[PDB]
Amino acid sequence: MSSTHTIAASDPHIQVMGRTHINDDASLTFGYPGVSLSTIVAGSRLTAEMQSSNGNSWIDVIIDNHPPTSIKLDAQQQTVELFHFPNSGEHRVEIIHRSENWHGQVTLKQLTLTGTQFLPAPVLPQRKILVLGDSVTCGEAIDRVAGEDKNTRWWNARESYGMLTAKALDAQVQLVCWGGRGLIRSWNGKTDDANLPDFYQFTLGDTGQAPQWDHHRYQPDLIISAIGTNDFSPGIPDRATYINTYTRFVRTLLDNHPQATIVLTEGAILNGDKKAALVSYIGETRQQLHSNRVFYASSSHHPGDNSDAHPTKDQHAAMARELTPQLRQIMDWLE
């Protein structure tokens, strides 16, 4: 007999890495980039019911070891074919959110397998990393192509330095980042957007009605904070103000994640005086913290290219190569 088997997105057969909101109909909604949902199945066809809030969100779909397929999701619910073969076999399926919150939020409602069964969920690594930051952490402009107007297709989470670093360290990762945002102000000088200490609390979104992320749902071994580019965009911010708020934020992290090691870094975009100032502010933050759980990693500036100052795909690869060795020493993950 031919049979189908449909499960909700929130079902134990679907592995989830990254922040998701569980809706009352057992669908999952997510906004941060890098959110990864995976399943292993025995069958010939697998489809998903998906939608995005603004029709401006992208995902990657990876079947077994094949090249990924990037798909832009319509604002209306649509059946998305993940794979289809003439015969049944065992297949691994991964969906990766490429977009970030301002692009919209994506919802996966349910999956339908034509075949025999969903197998046990893919097993994730034991090690867990959380990366906090701005659009560089979010993977903005990694997939740029010369000649195109920037659009939401340019974002790539899998090839961002945070995901490459986690992969090298055999670790899970959550990316909690928002383009244009800072620790205390946005690139445009505005101080009353949700800053990093605000959106760090949200499962997705950033309005008065954004759902609170329960930290018990992901307790990282390592937290990297790479925030700062946008705080320095208008000019170098006031030293006491910045250091006092960075200190207060890392105190929140330390208290929320009692087992975590925290690594602060200025990121790749700032250069020259602005870079040196943020490095300085980080050193003084650490001095005020007096914590044997808080460390620093140095990094190079990467200039982007003629089309966009955001670091390129090859620069993100370089960034992971520079950061990873320092993280091994800090975490004793000499692996």
Author numbering: 7 to 341
Task: Give sentences copied directly from the paper behind this entry.
Here we report the biochemical properties and crystal structure of several CE2 members, both single-module CE2 enzymes and CtCE2, a component of CtCel5C-CE2. The C-terminal domains possess an atypical α/β-hydrolase (SGNH-hydrolase) fold, consisting of repeating β-α-β motifs that form a curved central five-stranded parallel β-sheet, in the strand order β2, β1, β3, β4, and β5 with strand β2 interrupted by loop insertion.
CjCE2A is a canonical serine hydrolase, with a classical Ser-His-Asp triad, in which Ser-160 is the catalytic nucleophile, His-335 activates the serine, and Asp-333 makes a hydrogen bond with Nδ1 of His-335 thus completing the catalytic triad. The oxyanion hole, which stabilises the incipient tetrahedral transition-state, comprise the N of Ser-160 and Gly-205 and the Nδ2 of Asn-255. Based on their catalytic efficiencies, CtCE2 and CjCE2B exhibit a significant preference for acetylated glucomannan over xylan, whereas CjCE2A and CjCE2C do not distinguish between the two polysaccharides. Pull-down assays revealed that none of the Cellvibrio enzymes bound to insoluble cellulose. Although the two structurally characterised Cellvibrio esterases do not bind cellohexaose or cellulose, they do contain aromatic residues in the cleft that houses the active site. Thus, Tyr-665 in CtCE2 is conserved in the C. japonicus esterases (Trp-231 in CjCE2A and Tyr-206 in CjCE2B), while Trp-335 in CjCE2B is equivalent to Trp-790 in the Clostridium enzyme. To address this issue Tyr-683 and Trp-127, which are located in or at the interface, of the CBM-like domains of CtCE2 and CjCE2A, respectively, were mutated and the activities of the two esterase variants were assessed.
